[PDB]
Amino acid sequence: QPEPDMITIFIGTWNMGNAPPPKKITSWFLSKGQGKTRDDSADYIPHDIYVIGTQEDPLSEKEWLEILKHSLQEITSVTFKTVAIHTLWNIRIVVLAKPEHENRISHICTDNVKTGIANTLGNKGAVGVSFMFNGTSLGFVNSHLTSGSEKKLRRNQNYMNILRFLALGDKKLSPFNITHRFTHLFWFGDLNYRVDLPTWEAETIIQKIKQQQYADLLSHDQLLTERREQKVFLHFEEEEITFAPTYRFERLTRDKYAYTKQKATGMKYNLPSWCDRVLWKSYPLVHVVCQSYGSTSDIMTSDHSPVFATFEAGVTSQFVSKNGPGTVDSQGQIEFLRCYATLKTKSQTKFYLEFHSSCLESFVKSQEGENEEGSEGELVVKFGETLPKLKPIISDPEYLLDQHILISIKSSDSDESYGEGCIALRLEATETQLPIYTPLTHHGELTGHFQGEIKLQTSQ
Ligand SMILES: Fc1ccc(CNC[C@H]2CCCO2)cc1
Numbered sequence: 001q002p003e004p005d006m007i008t009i010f011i012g013t014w015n016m017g018n019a020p021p022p023k024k025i026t027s028w029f030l031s032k033g034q035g036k037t038r039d040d041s042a043d044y045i046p047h048d049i050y051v052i053g054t055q056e057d058p059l060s061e062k063e064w065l066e067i068l069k070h071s072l073q074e075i076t077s078v079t080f081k082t083v084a085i086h087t088l089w090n091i092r093i094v095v096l097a098k099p100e101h102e103n104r105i106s107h108i109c110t111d112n113v114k115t116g117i118a119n120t121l122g123n124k125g126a127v128g129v130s131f132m133f134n135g136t137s138l139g140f141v142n143s144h145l146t147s148g149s150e151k152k153l154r155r156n157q158n159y160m161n162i163l164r165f166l167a168l169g170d171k172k173l174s175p176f177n178i179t180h181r182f183t184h185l186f187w188f189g190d191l192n193y194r195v196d197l198p199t200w201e202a203e204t205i206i207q208k209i210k211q212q213q214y215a216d217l218l219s220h221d222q223l224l225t226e227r228r229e230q231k232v233f234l235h236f237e238e239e240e241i242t243f244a245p246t247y248r249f250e251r252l253t254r255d256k257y258a259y260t261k262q263k264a265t266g267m268k269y270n271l272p273s274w275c276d277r278v279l280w281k282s283y284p285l286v287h288v289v290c291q292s293y294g295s296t297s298d299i300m301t302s303d304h305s306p307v308f309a310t311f312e313a314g315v316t317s318q319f320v321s322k323n324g325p326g327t328v329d330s331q332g333q334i335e336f337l338r339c340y341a342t343l344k345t346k347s348q349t350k351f352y353l354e355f356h357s358s359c360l361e362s363f364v365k366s367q368e369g370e371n372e373e374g375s376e377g378e379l380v381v382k383f384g385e386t387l388p389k390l391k392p393i394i395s396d397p398e399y400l401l402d403q404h405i406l407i408s409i410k411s412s413d414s415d416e417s418y419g420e421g422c423i424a425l426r427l428e429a430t431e432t433q434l435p436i437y438t439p440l441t442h443h444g445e446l447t448g449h450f451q452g453e454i455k456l457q458t459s460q
Pocket of ligand 1: 081082083084096097101102103104105106
């Protein structure tokens with residue numbers, strides 16, 4: 001029975017509005033409704049992994065697991081195994097996998113982050129799950145961010161707190177936050193970003209939605225504009241939106257958007273918005289393709305509609321050779337040549353690098369670099385040909401060309417990371433000096449760049 005090199009992953013996000021679901025929710029898991037939908041000829045083909053994020057979920061874990069599992073069994077005639085379930089308040093994540101995957105899945109982690117302070121602490125935040133699927137690390141985050149059209153900057157702050165403080169994946173990757181710990185990271189939820197148009201335009205917006213004319217609405221979507229200005233979700237992807245706004249509906253129909261201010265809304269308007277979103281970030285040159293992104297039309301218990309997204313994702317096998325794991329393979333080496341970091345910092349500490357990768361027995365610390373001043377005010381840290389030669393555990397190019405090197409640049413004075421990035425070993429050539437590049441971030445914001453050349457020796 002061969003190991004897969006690609007799996008499909010279902011991501012769902014649904015703010016249930018504190019109401020029990022209707023008796024049939026299969027359209028969600030089939031990616032049917034509006035937007036980029038799944039072909040009918042695939043309806044009986046199970047996804048490998050289903051990740052369900054809810055917000056304002058009124059059900060017990062047991063109640064929701066029975067609904068989810070019975071839904072999937074009806075669609076696929078497969079009884080899924082529960083990988084993980086984690087709930088913070090009314091925010092929940094469930095991961096289900098085909099039974100054949102049970103022994104491929106290990107290192108299962110869960111965590112949550114509560115956002116805000118005092119007044120603003122007690123219902124918003126995120127839950128997440130991570131695990132290994134054979135040689136591939138997968139992370140999933142369901143967040144319920146701050147509500148309200150005038151609170152986009154709080155949502156952005158909620159995002160940074162979640163990526164800083166959510167503790168998932170390999171704890172040995174100490175300089176790295178969740179935006180660098182996984183081959184594939186999916187971040188979804190009720191992100192609560194709104195269409196920023198004047199209140200007076202509510203009926204105009206409704207008109208546009210009825211005509212399926214979303215362009216002048218998407219151009220005011222706060223998540224798209226904040227991303228374009230690099231204020232949030234830096235280096236994440238989102239599929240183009242081709243479905244109607246998923247909030248705020250009158251319950252029990254989808255014919256009406258309920259936008260006007262009421263005591264129940266704190267006297268706030270809720271113009272039609274794409275609150276409910278799925279984004280992802282995968283390591284460079286790893287296969288990931290969105291094959292659906294849309295909303296259901298027939299699940300109407302909540303003031304939100306469910307949102308689905310599905311993905312092809314590249315995965316790798318748990319590689320064994322006669323040498324590694326348990327030793328190095330001296331037919332392999334990674335040389336970083338003529339490298340330099342460009343940093344936005346004003347500090348004048350010396351810096352060193354750490355190289356982290358599951359192709360190494362343990363992380364590798366460099367010598368300190370040589371600081372120079374850039375012509376436009378920047379710090380340039382030069383490493384020369386001084387960098388340690390990295391000794392991978394396995395030299396076979398079928399393994400090594402699929403790996404990645406995480407890089408942290410750290411202050412000698414504080415040992416704190418000033419920037420994190422990732423280099424793919426999926427090179428055009430071996431035994432050849434080739435350019436490499438990564439942006440560097442810290443707490444998910446841009447702090448600099450790392451560039452230079454690499455020379456990769458494999459056993460071929
Ligand atoms: F749904 C799931 C999926 C995975 C698991 C954990 N399986 C661990 C692997 C390694 C050791 C033997 O199986 C439980 C439930």
